[PDB]
Design a protein around this ligand. Structure first.
Ligand SMILES: [Ca+2]
Ligand SMILES: [Ca+2]
Lengths: 78, 51, 49
């Protein structure tokens, strides 16, 4: 697209300010890829492999981590 | 020397679109602007009376 | 620049001129005709093209 624009895989041009900013806008997901790690957030739970999930998903009874660490008893002791 | 000057994209204000009153060999712009705004006019001919 | 031609009929054509008089020659498959009218000055003063 334009030099000040980023081209998604669907042929739609967005701005570079929308590249790696947390929200996905390129339909398929061409944005929010590569760049640097987002290192989760202060209000987000960190899975053992490095995946970031919302903190309300920690020990809710259902697995949400890829490795299933969110339901492990090591972090929440029943 | 850290903190390299890099080219990014920034938003810049868009002024109010001027109403044009149209007379026989001229235009009159009304040009409301709260802040200083650059108006540049040129003639599309041999002598560009650039104001 | 190119129009369709039936065995008989009429075709409309838009033209732009600068003369006050429309006394030019129009050709249609090389057949020449002469138009004649008086072209009024425009009312709007400023145009975008
Ligand atoms: Ca985005
Ligand atoms: Ca969960």
């Amino acid at each position: 697209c334009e030099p000040s624009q980023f081209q998604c895989t669907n042929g739609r041009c967005i701005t570079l300010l929308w590249k790696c900013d947390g929200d996905e806008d390129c339909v398929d997901g061409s944005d929010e890829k590569n760049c640097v790690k987002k290192t989760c957030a202060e209000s987000d739970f960190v899975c053992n492999n490095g995946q970031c999930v919302p903190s309300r998903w920690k020990c809710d009874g259902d697995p949400d981590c890829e490795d299933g660490s969110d339901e492990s008893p090591e972090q929440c002791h029943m | 020397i850290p903190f390299r000057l890099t080219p990014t994209v920034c938003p810049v204000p868009l002024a109010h679109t001027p109403t044009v009153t149209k007379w026989f060999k001229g235009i009159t712009l009304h040009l409301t602007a709260t802040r200083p705004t650059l108006l540049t006019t040129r003639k599309l001919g041999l002598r560009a009376d650039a104001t | 620049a190119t129009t369709h031609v039936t065995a008989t009929g009429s075709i409309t054509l838009h033209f732009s001129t600068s003369s006050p008089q429309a006394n030019f020659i129009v050709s249609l498959c090389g057949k020449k005709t002469t138009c004649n009218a008086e072209c009024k000055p425009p009312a709007d003063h400023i145009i975008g093209e």
